[PDB]
Swiss-Prot record:
The gene is VWF. Residues 10-186 form the VWFA domain. It comes from the Eukaryota. This is von Willebrand factor. Disulfide bonds join 5-191.
DNA sequence: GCCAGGGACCTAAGACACATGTCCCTGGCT
């Protein structure tokens, strides 16, 4: 509907930077992130946002404590560079979320959610400590919401995420074209997990 | 005992691990 989110929430967008998404498909992914951010009350007192493109490493474009205006944050999200890497590592970006983004829980009153937008399957070698990163995030009360996009999304890892906590709800889409159709449902679900201000 | 696959966990409050260690299930190899 005409829904907007004004809760105590740290929302992290993790964008698959592999060639499983074309440059075109990746523009539609960024558009979805921008569309989502337009339904957020972005502020240090309300919804804080982070945006990372992940390949075999993590490229952070927005940090939670970046004191820039929302208009500028939505622009930075719009111009996230297409990588088209051979590998996108869900393990790598969850490790990055655990040890860098949520290194310190210095805003304990807010809910913490990582939207994991995945279109690929990492080499098994890289998945060694996948479950421990997901469990590590659970122990920081970080909700991991996997969004499977294309037919190469790691369904094994989506299921492994779902089982670790009841609030780790999976969204399994056929392509990026279905993202805009579920924006209201996804943003509504994220928001209802976050507490209202006193 | 060795190798290749699939899982469960400790090294958990910042790491550096795409790494060691323990346990369980398959399939090969004197």
């Amino acid at each position: 509907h005409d829904f907007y989110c004004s809760r105590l929430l740290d929302l992290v967008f993790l964008l698959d930077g592999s060639s499983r998404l074309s440059e075109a498909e990746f523009e539609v992914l960024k558009a979805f992130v921008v569309d989502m951010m337009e339904r957020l009350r972005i502020s240090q007192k309300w919804v804080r946002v982070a945006v990372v493109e992940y390949h075999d490493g993590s490229h952070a474009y927005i940090g939670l404590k970046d004191r820039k205006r929302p208009s500028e944050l939505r622009r930075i999200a719009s111009q996230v560079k297409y990588a088209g890497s051979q590998v996108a590592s869900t393990s790598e970006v969850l490790k990055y979320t655990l040890f860098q983004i949520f290194s310190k829980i210095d805003r304990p009153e807010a809910s913490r959610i990582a939207l994991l937008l995945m279109a690929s399957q990492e080499p098994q070698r890289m998945s060694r400590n996948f479950v421990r990163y997901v469990q590590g995030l659970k122990k920081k009360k970080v909700i991991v919401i996997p969004v499977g996009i294309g037919p190469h999304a790691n369904l094994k890892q989506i299921r492994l995420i779902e089982k670790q906590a009841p609030e780790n709800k999976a969204f399994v889409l056929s392509s990026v074209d279905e993202l805009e159709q579920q924006r209201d449902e996804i943003v509504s679900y994220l928001c209802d997990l976050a507490p209202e201000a006193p």
